[PDB]
Design a protein around this ligand. Structure first.
Ligand SMILES: NC(=O)c1ccc[n+]([C@@H]2O[C@H](COP(=O)([O-])OP(=O)(O)OC[C@H]3O[C@@H](n4cnc5c(N)ncnc54)[C@H](O)[C@@H]3O)[C@@H](O)[C@H]2O)c1
Ligand SMILES: NC(=O)c1ccc[n+]([C@@H]2O[C@H](COP(=O)([O-])OP(=O)(O)OC[C@H]3O[C@@H](n4cnc5c(N)ncnc54)[C@H](O)[C@@H]3O)[C@@H](O)[C@H]2O)c1
Ligand SMILES: NC(=O)c1ccc[n+]([C@@H]2O[C@H](COP(=O)([O-])OP(=O)(O)OC[C@H]3O[C@@H](n4cnc5c(N)ncnc54)[C@H](O)[C@@H]3O)[C@@H](O)[C@H]2O)c1
Ligand SMILES: NC(=O)c1ccc[n+]([C@@H]2O[C@H](COP(=O)([O-])OP(=O)(O)OC[C@H]3O[C@@H](n4cnc5c(N)ncnc54)[C@H](O)[C@@H]3O)[C@@H](O)[C@H]2O)c1
Lengths: 323, 330, 323, 330
């Protein structure tokens, strides 16, 4: 039986102690402390001895596209750079905006900026962030020569493209250590995104296809690829930021092994609308995506606040072991 | 300037007058009244009197092309019946849903979904072979029946691909599954009959994916291309005279419809019903005015969002719009 | 075991049947159907044979202030006019805006209107509603003579004012059948509002007190009055729109009888922040405010949408019995 | 124009740099950075160098009067320690909380609150005499201890009212209870010692109300007037040089502080941390810009709202603001 007690600033600002005190502070601070424990359990299992080498715990990291628009892009890049996770799942924006950020920056704005004035100035709004139209022109100039080569390799070298194979290629092409997908392909970390056409990359494929028709992106082979990552794992953990396709696709892969061993959700969705996004971890227990003997954790919060704190208290403390 | 005033039950109970009074009641009731107005504006344009090679589609053009999107769980709910009615009577032109929203319409033709409670514990449900969807329950046997029904169809699809040159995409598969289920309770039966295409770019994310996966180890070779389906949905928008978007929930379904309409520099009419909030920067939670900034909604449109569970609001919306104009659609 | 099935509009628009189909539609539509059943159980008990006459079920109706700004003001007035509920609990805005609406209307606006331009034009925003400053000037001119008389009656006739006694007096003074509190005092329905100073009525008492000091509003006697309404009831029901003080004050009164027999919440709050507003009915079971054998219902929705539908399917169908 | 960029853990773990990077991370992380800026602006003004009969208060004026409001459940949480620290060191000037936020600070001096889970079932908890507050647990015996401690104090308050002319209000009672608990872990012990008034107009809505209720049948006569407490809080705003509002959660606490500041035609600085959303028309969920329309926030202020559980955000906020300036407050 653990008593509720917050951090006492009469001790001064001891940041490690302040973060540890979230566990006994209550409400979502306590869930944060539980999430730290669950992620550290994943890492401790992964470091147990037994293209990418198998480890004792396969960690799936999922995130919605807007988190790549945000500075959480740097947090994810760090984990991928140091081989701390094994499989990435994101929607199409979460692919393309990592690449675009290597060509031009995203800027801070406000949620309340009016769409008319923004559109008239060629500025696209993402929450309280701003992406100029010119960023996508740069993307077009960068991407079209690659699409030309991909069609050629398909038609003359027999290549059968899927979203994950295209994402590996785009990461190699961007050739920039600030990029998540640069590090992912270098470290043989696959990236799944079954609706890769739903964004700017789709715009480009669409326009490209009228001049150079025929590109195929098969989602069936990529379903086999993600499901086998779960089926042949010794143990699995899921770390899922946000909801939607990213959350369900990781969960359903883990259903194929009768459930993940560890799971942490950070998302703002609520259960009352019946949505998969808002479903509690215990819903996933009913269908076998989380094992009955797991102790999963959900933190109800904007991941832009919580995820850097979580990484500080887990992966970043064990960096030595990942090098 | 319109005064706030609620329905007066000293009039008795006239349900049409009750629903009309939402407009002057305030908060999301007022947004509901605005949504009724926007959908009726879409319908009135669609009925104005007024291609096939450009869209690579057999569906005849009308004066307003309406895109209807909905998340998968709304097909688990009774909103499945609401959507089926609109598709049955050719009241909308394009559907977008995620994979669950396809498969559970078909499964409901084989076995029912049941009422439960949100608080039922996962361990006991799992031990009893019952899967929870919010406060709904789907027995494992429903998926066994689905497997028995679907596996021969997947055999035929592979055979047609390898010897008749068929290049499958999600929308082409969904049309075939609707034809095979051959049941007037099914949304996708009516969609294929009425030449209403269904887009679902992540069609592998669900039970149909499970089945395709297992089937492929018995019968390898099925391919599902998402590139041609992007061409097909975008051309529905580009060659429209006018467009409206009616979007229930968020995620891929909402963005995919919005991005198609960006290709024509924006939708003319738009109604969102969803529970998501903007503060997390999500596309699901973004206000319609965010979409104006990137060109998916025209600057001169008057879009409407209702912040509510669509299981409550969507049947009322249909009652006051499409269902009132049924004669014009017959 | 009940199957999920929505209303089939191939039947045409049969509104009663459409509303009944919410019960088998799922998610919050099913909770709406459950709420109809729970309220009808309250009413059926109330109509069982055994200043205000006691009945077989005492119904407490609570609502946040903004719902009186809204057109739900008419819905509440109707229930109170016909003696369909027994105790009202609202915050201070929910008192004063009913009275002000008898002097001048509230108007429809938009949530996005900018505060600076509104303030410069003397327009106050309440959500997507608008109240001109002039409405409060009218209120001042109307109320100040009443405050003069209340101070006189306190100092010369021994009156000990409480919020509920002031609300009865204000209802008698407004003398207008459009007003909730006019009907409440006429029908001997008490109104509790322990923080009655938190709003425009407070502004007025404050300004009045410098010219005519001494008015006392005791909250202790009003605590005895609301608690005795629960303690001596045969059965109780709670119908609570929104959260905050209104929700807890009704619940805590019912804890004094070891719990309400029936309970329906309609509110938009979520549990994750630990708030009383967002707590599920089952939290209230732990502390004894809802009986262990009750079957309470929460609908997660804006009450401006749901409450008129709920009344249509419950109280309004039994109007004959209330006359 | 500032670029989006998150903290780079290739630097290692420097927690101050990590928190500073929230400003350029986006979404509510960016709002957190803006909140740090606004609170530090309040503090810097308060420390500028620079009545008693007008405010009927013994507290000396500073260059910025800071109002701190918080909902009751945050005193059930460990944020009680965070608030106590600010009050102990005279860093804020006025407190507003609901009744639970008073009584549970006192009860925690008698017995602890424990960690639990949101999903614990009410029937089993009730049968075991345990009350649930979110994912926290308070045994019934805590309230028994509270009763034993409080009843003699209520006896003295009635006696002082009837023979020494005392006219009790919530704030006067809260000062007395803080003096009686005589324990440096208590928020209200420090508030009365430092002449920080606490307003709680619905002080009867909770366990203190229960106790006053039962006590009154043994010892009739206690009166609690809310009119004088309205005069007292409003005069704190009217006679301020500058004001800031720091408001955790919504409800009465948020409006009561805002309405006091309306009396001076608006607060100069304002930070909200709350989880409520605007769509339901609620005051809790209203954006700061709503308060600009009615005059509670000055038109030239730059208020900030962070959409988050304060149990997560408030300790971080204090770490980067008040706790950095501790020396100036000593
Ligand atoms: N930057 C963009 O948002 C962007 C860009 C291009 C395309 N798109 C497309 O939009 C579609 C829908 O986007 P999506 O599925 O990535 O998610 P989404 O933005 O729709 O969010 C889904 C849910 O995830 C949760 N979530 C979102 N942001 C969160 C946060 N900061 N913290 C915690 N939880 C959070 C919320 O509950 C939200 O409702 C995708 O197909 C995507 O490619 C979006
Ligand atoms: N029945 C199921 O939920 C189910 C079944 C199989 C697979 N999946 C998979 O889960 C993935 C994610 O599901 P999704 O993208 O369809 O949506 P989702 O369930 O993740 O919902 C996305 C957002 O839509 C909004 N929404 C959901 N239900 C709503 C309602 N009742 N009223 C209003 N707004 C509502 C909410 O803001 C929610 O966060 C999909 O790829 C899907 O195939 C789900
Ligand atoms: N019109 C006004 O809002 C107004 C006017 C004058 C004074 N005030 C003062 O503001 C203070 C706080 O207001 P309050 O306690 O009445 O509530 P509130 O507006 O703070 O709402 C409390 C909670 O109730 C729920 N709620 C609100 N509106 C809802 C709706 N439409 N449907 C469902 N749930 C809903 C929400 O979860 C919300 O967070 C009170 O003391 C009041 O006197 C407000
Ligand atoms: N511990 C308790 O909760 C408790 C104890 C005794 C009595 N009560 C009574 O309940 C009544 C209502 O409680 P209240 O008005 O203090 O608030 P509440 O708990 O009703 O919360 C009001 C709103 O504040 C916001 N909020 C709450 N917790 C938050 C958090 N962790 N982070 C951010 N925002 C948050 C939310 O939007 C919430 O809807 C009061 O009269 C009180 O005395 C409660």
């Amino acid at each position: 039986s653990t008593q509720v007690r917050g951090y006492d600033f009469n001790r001064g600002v001891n940041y490690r102690a302040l973060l540890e005190a979230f566990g006994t502070t209550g409400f979502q601070a306590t869930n944060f402390g539980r999430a730290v424990q669950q992620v550290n359990a994943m890492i401790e299992k992964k470091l147990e001895p037994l293209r990418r080498p198998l480890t004792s715990c396969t960690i799936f990291l999922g995130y919605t596209s807007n988190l790549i628009s945000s500075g959480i892009r740097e947090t994810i890049r760090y984990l991928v750079q140091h081989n701390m996770v094994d499989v990435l799942v994101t929607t199409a924006g979460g692919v393309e905006e990592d690449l675009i950020k290597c060509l031009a920056p995203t800027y801070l704005g406000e949620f309340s900026l009016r769409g008319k004035e923004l559109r008239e100035n060629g500025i696209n709004r993402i929450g309280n962030l701003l992406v100029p139209n010119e960023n996508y022109c740069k993307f077009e100039d960068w991407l079209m020569p690659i699409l030309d080569q991909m069609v050629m390799e398909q038609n003359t070298e027999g290549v059968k493209w899927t979203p994950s194979k295209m994402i590996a290629r785009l990461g190699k092409e961007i050739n920039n250590p600030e990029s998540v997908y640069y590090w992912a392909q270098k470290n043989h970390i696959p990236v799944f995104s079954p609706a890769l056409t739903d964004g700017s990359l789709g715009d480009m494929i669409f326009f490209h296809s009228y001049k150079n028709p025929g590109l195929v992106l098969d989602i069936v082979e990529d379903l086999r690829l993600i499901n086998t990552q779960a089926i042949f794992a010794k143990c699995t953990g899921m770390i899922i930021l946000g909801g939607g396709v990213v959350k369900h696709h990781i969960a359903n892969a883990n259903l194929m092994r009768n459930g993940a061993d560890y799971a942490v959700y950070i998302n703002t969705a609520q259960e009352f609308d019946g949505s998969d996004s808002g479903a509690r971890p215990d819903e996933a227990v009913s269908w076998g995506a989380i094992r009955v003997d797991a102790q999963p954790v959900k933190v109800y919060a904007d991941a832009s606040l919580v995820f850097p704190l979580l990484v500080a208290e887990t992966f970043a403390q064990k960096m030595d072991a990942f090098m």
